[PDB]
Amino acid sequence: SRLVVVSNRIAPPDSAGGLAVGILGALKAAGGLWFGWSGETGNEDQPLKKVKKGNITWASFNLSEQDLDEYYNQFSNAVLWPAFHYRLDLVQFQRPAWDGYLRVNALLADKLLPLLQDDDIIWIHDYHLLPFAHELRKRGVNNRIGFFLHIPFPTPEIFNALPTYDTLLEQLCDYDLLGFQTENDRLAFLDCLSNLTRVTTRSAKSHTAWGKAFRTEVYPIGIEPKEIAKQAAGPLPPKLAQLKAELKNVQNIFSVERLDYSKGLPERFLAYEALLEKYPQHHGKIRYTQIAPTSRGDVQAYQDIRHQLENEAGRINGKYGQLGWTPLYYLNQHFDRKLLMKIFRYSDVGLVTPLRDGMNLVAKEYVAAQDPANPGVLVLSQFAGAANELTSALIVNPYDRDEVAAALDRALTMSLAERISRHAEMLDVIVKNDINHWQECFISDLKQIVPR
Amino acid sequence: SRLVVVSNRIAPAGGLAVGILGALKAAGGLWFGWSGETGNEDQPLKKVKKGNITWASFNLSEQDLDEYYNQFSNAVLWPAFHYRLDLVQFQRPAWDGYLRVNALLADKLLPLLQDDDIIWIHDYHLLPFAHELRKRGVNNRIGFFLHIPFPTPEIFNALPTYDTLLEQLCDYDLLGFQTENDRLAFLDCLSNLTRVTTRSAKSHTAWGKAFRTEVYPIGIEPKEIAKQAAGPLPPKLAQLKAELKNVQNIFSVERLDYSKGLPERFLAYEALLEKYPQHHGKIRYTQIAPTSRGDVQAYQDIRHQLENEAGRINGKYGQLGWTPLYYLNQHFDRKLLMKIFRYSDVGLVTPLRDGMNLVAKEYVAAQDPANPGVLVLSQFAGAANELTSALIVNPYDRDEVAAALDRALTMSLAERISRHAEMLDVIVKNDINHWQECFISDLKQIVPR
Amino acid sequence: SRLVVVSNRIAPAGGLAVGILGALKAAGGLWFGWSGETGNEDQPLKKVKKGNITWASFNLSEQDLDEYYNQFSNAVLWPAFHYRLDLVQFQRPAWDGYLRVNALLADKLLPLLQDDDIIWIHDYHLLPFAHELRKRGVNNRIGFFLHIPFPTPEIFNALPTYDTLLEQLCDYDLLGFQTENDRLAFLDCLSNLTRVTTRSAKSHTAWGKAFRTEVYPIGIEPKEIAKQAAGPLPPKLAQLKAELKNVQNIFSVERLDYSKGLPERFLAYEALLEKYPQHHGKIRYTQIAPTSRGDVQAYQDIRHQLENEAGRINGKYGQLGWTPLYYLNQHFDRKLLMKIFRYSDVGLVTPLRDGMNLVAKEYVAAQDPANPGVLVLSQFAGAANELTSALIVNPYDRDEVAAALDRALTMSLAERISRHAEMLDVIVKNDINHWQECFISDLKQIVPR
Amino acid sequence: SRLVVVSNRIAPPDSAGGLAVGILGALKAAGGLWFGWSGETGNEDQPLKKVKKGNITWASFNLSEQDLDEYYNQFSNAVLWPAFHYRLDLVQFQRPAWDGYLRVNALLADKLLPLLQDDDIIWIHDYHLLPFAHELRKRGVNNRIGFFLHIPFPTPEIFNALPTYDTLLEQLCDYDLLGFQTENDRLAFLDCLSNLTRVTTRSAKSHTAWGKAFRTEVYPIGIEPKEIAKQAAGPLPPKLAQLKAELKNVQNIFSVERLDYSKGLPERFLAYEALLEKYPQHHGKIRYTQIAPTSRGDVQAYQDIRHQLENEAGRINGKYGQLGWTPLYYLNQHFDRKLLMKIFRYSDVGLVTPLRDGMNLVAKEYVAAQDPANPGVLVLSQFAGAANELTSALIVNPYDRDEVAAALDRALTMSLAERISRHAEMLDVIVKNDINHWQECFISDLKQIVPR
Ligand SMILES: O=c1ccn([C@@H]2O[C@H](COP(=O)(O)OP(=O)(O)O[C@H]3O[C@H](CO)[C@@H](O)[C@H](O)[C@H]3O)[C@@H](O)[C@H]2O)c(=O)[nH]1
Ligand SMILES: O=c1ccn([C@@H]2O[C@H](COP(=O)(O)OP(=O)(O)O[C@H]3O[C@H](CO)[C@@H](O)[C@H](O)[C@H]3O)[C@@H](O)[C@H]2O)c(=O)[nH]1
Known part of the structure; x- marks a missing residue:
């Protein structure tokens, strides 16, 4: 009992x-x-x-x-x-x-x-x-x-x-x-x-x-799935509703996790760099946002990974940035989960490429949060537990930064028909x-x- | 002769x-x-x-x-x-x-x-x-x-x-x-x-x-600076002039070297962001700094530190739709830089030690005299002996630098005019x-x- | 054929x-x-x-x-x-x-x-x-x-x-x-x-x-190792053999690479010095490690760390007349290294991962079988499958490594003989x-x- | 009153x-x-x-x-x-x-x-x-x-x-x-x-x-001067008496100070390196001992200088060391002042080369501690306050590592007659x-x- x-x-009782x-x-x-x-x-x-x-x-x-x-x-x-x-x-x-x-x-x-x-x-x-x-x-x-x-x-x-x-x-x-x-x-x-x-x-x-x-x-x-789709379809806070509108001709690539070395965040930044280097036609037309609240900050290895990530954000933006275009938005900040669902819904690409992850709920959340009639694309590391069930994702090896970059390009240009197909197949697995x-x-x- | x-x-x-x-x-x-x-x-x-x-x-x-x-x-x-x-x-x-x-x-x-x-x-x-x-x-x-x-x-x-x-x-x-x-x-x-x-x-x-x-x-x-500054921006650059209608721009450009006090500058902007939350979402600091003399002992340990600090500061104070600090490690044409000066509301020139610093003088010669920006200048810059109307600061005192920045961002048109006209007369003479x-x-x- | x-x-x-x-x-x-x-x-x-x-x-x-x-x-x-x-x-x-x-x-x-x-x-x-x-x-x-x-x-x-x-x-x-x-x-x-x-x-x-x-x-x-090991030392090397009559020598030589776990080794010696104060003034750890493959991404960040750690450990535990840790970033002839093995009381071979590790086998082939030193060997070395009589350790457990070191330094002649003769028979076969x-x-x- | x-x-009341x-x-x-x-x-x-x-x-x-x-x-x-x-x-x-x-x-x-x-x-x-x-x-x-x-x-x-x-x-x-x-x-x-x-x-x-x-x-x-000479002439503790005897044909170069960035300790190590590099005839026959207890260890700049010094000790010994000869002894340890006087007396060279020092008492202590009948040699930075009065020292500029090295060599080979002269002139100033x-x-x- x-x-x-x-x-x-x-x-x-009382996120x-x-x-x-x-x-x-x-x-x-x-x-x-x-x-x-x-x-x-x-x-x-x-x-x-x-x-x-x-x-x-x-x-x-x-x-x-x-x-x-x-x-x-x-x-x-x-x-x-x-x-x-x-x-x-x-x-x-x-x-x-x-x-x-x-x-x-x-x-x-x-x-x-x-x-x-x-x-x-x-x-x-x-x-x-x-x-x-x-x-x-x-x-x-x-x-x-x-x-x-x-x-x-x-x-x-x-x-x-x-x-x-x-x-x-x-x-x-x-x-x-x-x-x-x-x-x-x-x-x-x-x-x-x-x-x-x-x-x-x-x-x-x-x-x-x-x-x-x-x-x-x-x-x-x-x-x-029912709760995530509800949260995700709800109105954005006014300031974020404003931003969504201002980004009409900008494709958003989005990632969120605890700032952990298991998540492969530097390797991910390097892949974004590789996308910017080898696919210049996206310059000024895409953004990558990485939300990564500090986790376990008393532990030296966690301070180390955070310092590495700060450096790479500054280097990448320092090199590919323009006066009126910041390529990479890095936020060392925690976001409410209900809000994240809304942000997932308006993001064209979910980038979830951990080096090793028991499962990774962010990947399942991202496709549950999508509008089934106009869904974004999941790019997923083969080393996340989730990859066993989300086989319709763009599955990648984060040790090959050029493969991840290629998948980002493929995601950014995927037809509606193929986005729907891949999304519906993933959603079916996570609803079941x-x-x-x-x-x-x-x-x-x-x-x-x-x-x- | x-x-x-x-x-x-x-x-x-x-x-x-x-x-x-x-x-x-x-x-x-x-x-x-x-x-x-x-x-x-x-x-x-x-x-x-x-x-x-x-x-x-x-x-x-x-x-x-x-x-x-x-x-x-x-x-x-x-x-x-x-x-x-x-x-x-x-x-x-x-x-x-x-x-x-x-x-x-x-x-x-x-x-x-x-x-x-x-x-x-x-x-x-x-x-x-x-x-x-x-x-x-x-x-x-x-x-x-x-x-x-x-x-x-x-x-x-x-x-x-x-x-x-x-x-x-x-x-x-x-x-x-x-x-x-x-x-x-x-x-x-x-x-x-x-x-x-x-x-x-x-x-x-x-x-x-x-x-x-x-x-x-x-x-x-001064004439040629004003001429270059006044010219038409390249298209992509006039795409963010009236995109930032409500956002004020603080601007610095220099060589990377230890004398310029670049990390100290980032710390001062942080202190502004920390103690004057009114400005969030409404200002930006842009730093241009092309690498220089990384050949012997490579002062390039400062490049690395600036990268870290831009990432740190943006990570702390940034928002989904607002990046506080733009750090660009890139070469820009002189002509274009003159135009950026003109469209920047605040010129931040705070070296730890400088023979003269021509950027301070360029910044004010490039201004529209009808609607000029404010110069915040280190007392350790040789230009500070003459540009007495600049907002003069001690960069070893990051809160004083932040307060100057706050003062520059709120300064009335009347005061911005008389300070600028004063500095400009000196540079023309x-x-x-x-x-x-x-x-x-x-x-x-x-x-x- | x-x-x-x-x-x-x-x-x-x-x-x-x-x-x-x-x-x-x-x-x-x-x-x-x-x-x-x-x-x-x-x-x-x-x-x-x-x-x-x-x-x-x-x-x-x-x-x-x-x-x-x-x-x-x-x-x-x-x-x-x-x-x-x-x-x-x-x-x-x-x-x-x-x-x-x-x-x-x-x-x-x-x-x-x-x-x-x-x-x-x-x-x-x-x-x-x-x-x-x-x-x-x-x-x-x-x-x-x-x-x-x-x-x-x-x-x-x-x-x-x-x-x-x-x-x-x-x-x-x-x-x-x-x-x-x-x-x-x-x-x-x-x-x-x-x-x-x-x-x-x-x-x-x-x-x-x-x-x-x-x-x-x-x-x-094995024959040629014993031959080389037995030969006369260069003069300056036989000046410290009977200068260290009462000082036991722990010895390691290898290439600098991440697989060898060199900083981990220094940490283990520190733990020995920290928890077994009986040994102060009476032992020494000598590490030889010539730089290698510092060409791409340069594992040479490990050279730097070893330099730091030798300085740290000696600074803490050293005395005016006793240096606990000798770190040498120098090339030594194979012939001489065979003689050092013979005159060293403890052979420390603790890689984090190693295909085989020939040093472990050289160390025991070089020994005087009448008065041999002790091999402390990582379980992650391929040689550990055969050198079962070595003191086998987990280098991730620095206190276990220190205790092995303590055990090796106090080991009776009888036990040193049977362990060595056992390992040696295996290497000869x-x-x-x-x-x-x-x-x-x-x-x-x-x-x- | x-x-x-x-x-x-x-x-x-109760060093x-x-x-x-x-x-x-x-x-x-x-x-x-x-x-x-x-x-x-x-x-x-x-x-x-x-x-x-x-x-x-x-x-x-x-x-x-x-x-x-x-x-x-x-x-x-x-x-x-x-x-x-x-x-x-x-x-x-x-x-x-x-x-x-x-x-x-x-x-x-x-x-x-x-x-x-x-x-x-x-x-x-x-x-x-x-x-x-x-x-x-x-x-x-x-x-x-x-x-x-x-x-x-x-x-x-x-x-x-x-x-x-x-x-x-x-x-x-x-x-x-x-x-x-x-x-x-x-x-x-x-x-x-x-x-x-x-x-x-x-x-x-x-x-x-x-x-x-x-x-x-x-x-x-x-x-x-009277107290220092008394302390300095007293018997060494047994273990140190033993060591003195074992060093009969070794010339000792000695330094002691708080581990402070004002003291120019890395620059000093670099000068010792320069001595070893350009005067190889001292190999195996000299030792440099640096005692440097940690001071103000809560302050970042003091941790920084300590880490720098540890590295240089390891590098120098790593490069010039031999199986039975350690060139540089670095001790991050505090020594009693009465004992230091005895150690000064048995040291052939006192090396005191701060970048900036109000006075520097170690320099005055070193020559007060000497046996006037067989005195060692003071090598002194021109940037120590003491250099104003100890003009008979070997005065050096620590920004020129080769000059400091030359002075170390000169000190190590100085005749009895000249050591006495220089010592007596310094001692007279500090007694007056x-x-x-x-x-x-x-x-x-x-x-x-x-x-x-
Ligand atoms: O700013 C943030 C960042 C993250 N999240 C949420 O935090 C959770 C993160 O969980 P997950 O993506 O699974 O990563 P982990 O933090 O690593 O948690 C561990 O536990 C989860 C539950 O089993 C497993 O999926 C992981 O593989 C395991 O590493 C998600 O629901 C996120 O939406 C927030 O709400 N706000
Ligand atoms: O292990 C140690 C290290 C040092 N000392 C003694 O500490 C004193 C050090 O004084 P000094 O050599 O003068 O250096 P400082 O520590 O820097 O002290 C400051 O104050 C002294 C008194 O005015 C001035 O000579 C210096 O220039 C000033 O920087 C001396 O008596 C040393 O013998 C010890 O007893 N044990």
């Missing part, structure tokens, strides 16, 4: 993101509890902050500065994030970080225990909480527990470099259900596990390792694998496990 | 060049000067004749270039004279090459010289030139003009070879500077080393060598023609040794 | 070269290979003959060099194959040039080929070489040996041209790798693209093309002679198409 | 530096009070911390983090220090910094007032307290107040770039007595004042500006202008002013 969801952050709509859909159906970090530092030793509306309860706690630094800044974001995105060169393994990561998981488990009921189903989200099922088991919780990894799971040759990889695998197997964005992530997890210990598998997705039974499954996260479908499949699978 | 001018680079228009040509057109004579590469190391000089002027040019070796021009002149003299001892990179092989090429240049000029010539030498690459001429017996009236600042003793005396440089400069009969403070700095430097006697106004003796000093602040040709004529007339008056 | 070897750079000694020479001395034949500059772009190949071996070399254009060797091979293939996709810099002009030069090289070799030849191609610059040979009708047995790692699909498939590279590699009759995991990675890459059939042990079909794969971990010549003979014998067994 | 001294830091011995000499003679910052951040609102031994009292206060940042880190060390050392390119003028600088001076004056007596003579030290006389006057203190500037005072063309230069001059004239290290500093101050306002001068050193009367004077700070002489002259001059 009751659903408990915990994740690193939680969204209480609803992609994951939030999914969690809330699940919680609204079952009723239950959403538990996680308040996003605040300091004053940890105040009671849990609780809200209750109808059937759902929201609960949060603060974290100390040390715990945040070792758990979130260091281990999560400077070890697991770079490794799981195939950047060994960036991980900063240190023992205190690893100890902090275990400490906060144990802390969270301790806070959570009194709030649990015997029949609860428990859903844990993301790489911050890899050890969490294990911490629950050692505290006597026998409940069904599922995990969803929102990011890629790396192959053995990368995963096995983590000094702590073996402990991570052992603890992952304390979940009854492990969910991944793509088939390759699930396979990679099983591949790392099989390299470490004997695994017994039945029908691809049911396993035993060290005598522990667990299932695996793929649930590619999605969007709410909804965010509702995504949470319903996960919860249905979780309810099926016979608890220990 | 022939005039022989020599200067670094030549021209078979510009600003200094109109002054040299004007001086040559009056007297008749010869312009003698260098031209980069090599094209041909061991070749006869280029003797090309118009009517009164005879034009002669010559090459160089890549070894001479590096020690002479790329090293001593531009890695010791230029940074030191602009108050940056931290940027001097003295090596004796380069001092030696500096003297070598001066002596070479002197060797090629000697044959082309006539007894009754008056001779006029330009700028810091040729501080030693009159000494090398004296060593060859030439007794002619020779004058020097220094285009950059002359530093105070506490800076100049750090130069390992300051005392030679000082002995050599006193072989000129006349030494011209852009400001009184440059003239005084030189005299103070010379006074710290040796006894100098001033028996009458601006007339000196040191080590028994007689010489004069004087101030000739280089000027502009001391034009490039007046400048050259004053220097020549003074040089002519000297009795040769 | 002739052997034709081709490899990048040649030699009219080393390690691979003794293997190629040994294989050529047995069969007789020809070594065919490149040599940098140009010296002469359009010149006949260099046909120099000993007795059984005939040696042929040729030049190249600076455009071919940059796209072929400086770009695709070393800016795409090398970083990708060492698990650094973030360092790949793919441009199609360089892919094209990569194919161009392979085809050129194939054109010059064709005439020098004989019907009954066996052919042996070395390393990643020539992945396409057997395809270009097939296009010219040569049906000979051709084998390939890859000296560097072959990456897993998740890395390899990122290469814009991975599928061509895969089709081309299957034109070799035999493909040799340094480890089982490289062999498996290749097969997994090929399996992701197309159906491959393995009807019998290590024998495959793909697109109807038959080929074999196998593991030949490159080895050393699989020596450079065994390696070449195994590859040749397998290549000979194939029935030509 | 009673002397009050205030300075940014104070030295209570006595150069300035401290001078202050304490003065205080011991008059009796009185030494007042200043404790060096501690936080908990400002605890009572003044007071000690009393015989006739002297020591008093200190803590400063808040904000006050420290704006007063000490920002205005003092990132504006006044770079400007007064001719580095306009490094000053970081911002209004809040300037306001903080005034605030802390006012704060110090407020703390100090109740502790004053009508007949006190008051001695203020250094650029942190330029406004301090002024703050005292506005609080009704008529006492004789003297100031000593320990660093250079820059010419008008540099001074006048400080946005706040005019206020600084006005406030300086509230002192009855202003003391400088050299005649050029005093002249430079008067030059800046004369450029701003009409100054009336009698007999060079007695002035009026804005109707305010004040005197100027030069007091070049010095050393305690003692630290005792320095404080006695200052106090004698201060007692002479007729208080307002």
